Amino acid sequence: EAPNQALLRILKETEKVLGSGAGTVYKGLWIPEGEKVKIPVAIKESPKANKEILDEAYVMASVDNPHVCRLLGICLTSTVQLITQLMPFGCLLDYVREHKDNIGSQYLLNWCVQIAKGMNYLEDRRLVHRDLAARNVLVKTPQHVKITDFGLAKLLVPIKWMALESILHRIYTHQSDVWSYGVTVWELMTFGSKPYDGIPASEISSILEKGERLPQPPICTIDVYMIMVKCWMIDADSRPKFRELIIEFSKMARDPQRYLVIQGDEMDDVVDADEYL
C-alpha cells in the first residue's frame, strides 16, 4: 500500500448548535489567521471516545473528491473537535422528508449519480465506508451532495443498511457498500421512509434469508427498482459496481420523467471550503 501523505491540520480555538445526540455538531466560522477569509464550517465534538473520533479524523483527512466530505482540521483545546465544510442544507434524510412535495425526478436521479461517484472514489482509495445511508449524505446545495461520516470506514451497527453477508459473517467489501447504496436510494425514492419499519433488527437477517426485500417505491419505474434489487442480490459479485451505477443513473438523469413518476414534477470575505485550497 502507498504511504498516506495527507496533511493533518491543527487549528487554534481562537481561529450555534446544529444537533446533538448519540455527539454535538455546531455551525461556525473559521478565519485562518493572516488570510482575509471566513470559511463556514461544521464542528463535531474519555480515552475511548478520543480514540474513535481520531480514527474518523484520519479517514476524513485522507479523502479529496467533489462528492466526499474532507476534514479541514482538528482542534485539541479540551475535547477533540473535527472541523469540516459546513453543509448548510443538512443531511439528505431530513432534507427529503422536509421538502418531499418539492423534489423532482431530476434531483433524485442526480443525487444517485453523485453518491455513486463518491462511493466509486472511495473504492478507488480502497476504503469501505460501512455506514452509507441517507443520514450520512449531506447537502451543500440541492444540486451538490457529498458522502460523510467515516467513523466506521476501513481499508478493504446499522443492521437495516447492511448486506446479508455482513450481518451473518462480518464480511465487508465494496460490494457490501453497494447493498447499503441500494437501501440509501430506496430512502431517497420513498422521501425518507424508514426501511423495514416496525421489524426489529434481530429479525432482519432471517427476513433477508427468506428472500424478502424492500418494496418498490410508488414513484419508481421498474427500471429504477430493478437497479435497487440488483444491489440486494446474495451473490456480492453479482451486484452492480459503483462505476456502473454512475453510468446507469446518468442515462436516466437525461430523461428523468421516463424513470421516476412524481405528481407535479413538471459577509464580505466569506469563501466556501471548496474554493479554499
Ligand SMILES: CN1C[C@@H]2C[C@]2(C#Cc2cc3ncnc(Nc4cccc(Cl)c4F)c3cc2NC(=O)CCCN2CCOCC2)C1
Ligand atoms: C434540519 N436542518 C437543521 C440544520 C441546518 C440543517 C443542518 C445540518 C448539518 C450540517 C453539517 N455540515 C457538515 N458536517 C456535518 N456532519 C459531520 C459529519 C462528520 C464529521 C463532521 Cl466534522 C461533521 F460536521 C453536518 C451535519 C448536519 N446535520 C445532519 O447531518 C443531520 C442528519 C441526521 N441525523 C444524523 C445522525 O443521527 C440522527 C439524524 C438542516
